[PDB]
């Protein structure tokens, strides 16, 4: 088996980023070559491991086999601006215009999320990593493109018809009046296949493990439940739910007691909705979840 994919998702700020770091560590404990890929422009991972990372995979300190890759459209952008600037030298006018268009792209809202997309696909076709752990929160909408290939197929057929009708007209035009679709079709197909390979790898349990992270709070439970549902529609298996920031059993003050009782209610809720799934529990730490120490500790708690 070439490469295995784990990915963590769930509501905002529940430990997606924390669990993926801890899983990275644990899987690195067994000798395995693991990369964690992060779309946080927040660059959460920096704050966790207490180390700088880049758009090119970096070894986490202490580990030869743990890497983190943080997608930064802007950096790779500027690198490319400097590079293209050399090519354009024959033509400053075209060159400055292309520079401008580039920048304009870079600043437009969609484009940051689609840098992420391109990276995602590059790592879905990749080898050289035993395990790739996607930190970036998938959802029904984030993965909505897996439905793309079918539409792409329809559209491609319409294009094919169109190409045939044009080719008849154009030839006559050239003959009578002196003096494209292949390219468009090629691109469409290339992408269609990339996405199809991806959808097959994610929809296959052997290769990819999707994991949901929740808090004992109605909100996280409900979001992550809906998520489970959309994903269930794509074919993506969810092997596990991880409850996190559980208040531990030894609590005394009226406060902790109260919040813990509420948490137990929500744990009945979780056990109800996701109960058909493996559920792991993680407690709320006295310390913040920060060091590689507390990380190894968390990983141990998960296993």
């Amino acid at each position: 088996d070439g490469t295995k994919y784990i990915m963590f998702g769930g509501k905002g700020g529940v430990g997606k980023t924390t669990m993926s770091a801890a899983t990275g560590v644990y899987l690195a404990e067994k000798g395995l070559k693991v990369v964690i890929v992060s779309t946080d422009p927040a660059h959460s991972l920096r704050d966790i491991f207490e180390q700088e990372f880049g758009h090119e995979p970096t070894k986490v300190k202490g580990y030869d086999n743990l890497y983190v890759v943080e997608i930064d459209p802007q950096k790779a952008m500027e690198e490319y601006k400097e590079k293209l600037k050399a090519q354009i030298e024959e033509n400053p006018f075209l060159g400055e215009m292309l520079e401008d268009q580039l920048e304009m792209a870079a600043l437009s809202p969609g484009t940051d999320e689609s840098a992420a997309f391109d990276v995602f696909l590059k790592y879905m076709d990749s080898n050289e990593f035993d395990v790739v752990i996607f930190d970036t929160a998938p959802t029904g909408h984030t993965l909505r493109f897996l439905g793309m290939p079918e539409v792409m197929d329809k559209y491609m057929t319409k294009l094919i018809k169109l190409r045939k009708q044009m080719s008849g007209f154009m030839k006559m035009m050239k003959k009578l009046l002196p003096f494209d679709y292949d390219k468009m079709l090629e691109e469409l197909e290339k992408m269609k296949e990339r996405i199809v390979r991806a959808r097959n790898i994610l929809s296959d349990p052997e290769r990819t493990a999707f994991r949901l992270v929740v808090i004992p709070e109605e909100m996280s439970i409900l979001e992550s439940e809906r998520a489970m549902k959309a994903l269930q529609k794509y074919g993506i298996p969810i092997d596990a739910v991880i409850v996190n920031q559980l208040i531990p059993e030894d609590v005394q003050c009226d406060f902790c007691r109260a919040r813990r009782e509420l948490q137990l209610k929500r744990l009945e809720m979780i056990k109800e909705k996701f109960g058909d799934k493996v559920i792991a529990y993680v407690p709320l730490l006295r310390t913040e979840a920060k060091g590689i120490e507390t990380l190894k500790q968390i990983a141990k708690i998960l296993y």
Copy 2:
């Protein structure tokens, strides 16, 4: 004064969505007509107010003046597919092709974030709402487009030169051989102005209040600090920081005591970094922050 804009941002899951709902309620308490606009595909607000919302503003129950708008590119999409399907009737072939292209857009990653962008601009040019509260997390990168206008200006000038050189050539082509830019420039300018109006309204304190939400945890404090900085570079004023999920003073078990001590450290950190700003504090509730009751309560606590 026509319309006022409040917007909350800060790390993932710190209470952006919660504070904006509570501010919505409080501002509605004083008779005021307030809309909360949400880019969460999570649809958090549904879970908070315990009510369904749509891409068209909906009254929160019990309130004539409180509305929630949830941007859903997909819904407005399908509405439009059904609509366009009627226009295309003369030409199924072109019609089906346009349908396809549409769907392909919809599924592409960027496009979801730019639906949000379009709505944002529509509400920036809008009246009819006394207060518009943006729930969607702005950051340096989410607002990076406010720098667009200037690049747009450069590019527009290059386009103007180009138009003049083409018109000389084209005229000659037409006479010598039988047998665009105005449109492009018009669009560019239209958008440039929209964004400039927006940048002026957000950079103006009288009109827009930007608010940061943090947890006493090194991570949220650091993110929201960087955010503060990027925003400070656009000219966007940050009038207030709201610390949230503060463990209250009455705590007994060793656990709460420990976490509270840590929080107090981080409160010295917040007081340090944002201290030049107004800081409001909110406690961690025994109950989940859910009902309109606990919402009015939170609002009261904020004021």
Copy 3:
């Protein structure tokens, strides 16, 4: 009445060019401001008047009011290459490319005949000349474009439908994702009108006199007859036929006698086919038809 148009056509080498020059002279005899416009790249007129002419109207020597304009796509071309070269200076790369495309146009076969077309239309919309005499041989096919307006009309309507269907689609494209026909329709209409004004002026006897030149030879008679027919289909009136190079009555040698007899047969043919039209006869000169002397003489013979 603003401007009057005479035009001569008929087989190759029958005196189109000769009769137009003589008509130019005669009409200039009565004080009248007359321009002869010539598409011969042969530049026949130079050889007739024994003088150089250019793409800008030139006074024939001895006459303030007689001008000749010889359309030379190539000259006006080079003039324009030199001019455009100054505009492109900011961008040599775009500039040299445009230069190349221009030259490529210039050398392509159609383009020489359409330079003629453009001039023709410029003089059809013109004032400042009492009489414009087109030397260039019209025929059914040379004037076939007068039927253009109607097709242009159909096509325009299809374009209008198309524009409406696009505007519905493009409009959503922009909102969903960031970030022509008016121009095409404007051009189409501009030309359609130009051609319609033209067809109305030529189809009008008061304004334009179409004249056919023949030799007493089966060939010229047949060509010019077919010409008469196509033209009759456009609504173009043919006011006169001019038989030319008639062998005079005083002839002696068996040779002249023979050819003259043949000519008289063909004159019965002409009188038969065109008889419903005014027919003028011109004899075959002992001298070549060259000088302004023989020209005034010919004109006198015509009137």
Copy 4:
């Protein structure tokens, strides 16, 4: 040797069409398979051979090996309109539009001359004919496109540069933003080669004989001299000049004597200017040059 090309040019109405028909006959006399190709929309050849011809080669009556092809853009057009109308059936809207655009082409002035061009090229790449005789008057300007290949080369190189700079940018946009020249270059090259093969065949004496036809009149002599010069600049050899419509030596009336004296002057002129070339003389017939009889007679006179 595959195919040989003869082509006759000279002033309007000097016997281009007559000499080419006579050469056709003579070459067919020796068993040889000869086609005459005519761009006259006049359809002169019909009048000569007294027979109908079409855009597909037709045997001249009495001859298996003598064909005439008359290029008629309009006929081949209508044939094609009827054909395309069947293909478009799935889409009337696109179909009618294409029909319209076609007609518009057909009526446009250039397009008739370029139909001729296309045919010319088809017969330059052709076999199946021992001898192809081009009736259509070449000149410096009619053949001016033979200079096209070099400009085509320059432009192609600019295109190549452009293609490389686009491919860098395009790849980057696809990757950053979800989600032609090959075709243009292919066409350019295809045509460039076609024209180069042509220019090599015409510039080669072994394969192609260019022949100039004149009248003993200053005009024809001057035109055909300039023609000789432009052609000499393309590398096209002119093997022969044919003086035509020479008044014979037996003449009596003062008239014939006069015109003949003038002709002898112009014959000194021809002998002067073209004297370095083979010159054949043809007399002015008592009969019109019409029947296949007088044609065989003329051919005998040429040989």
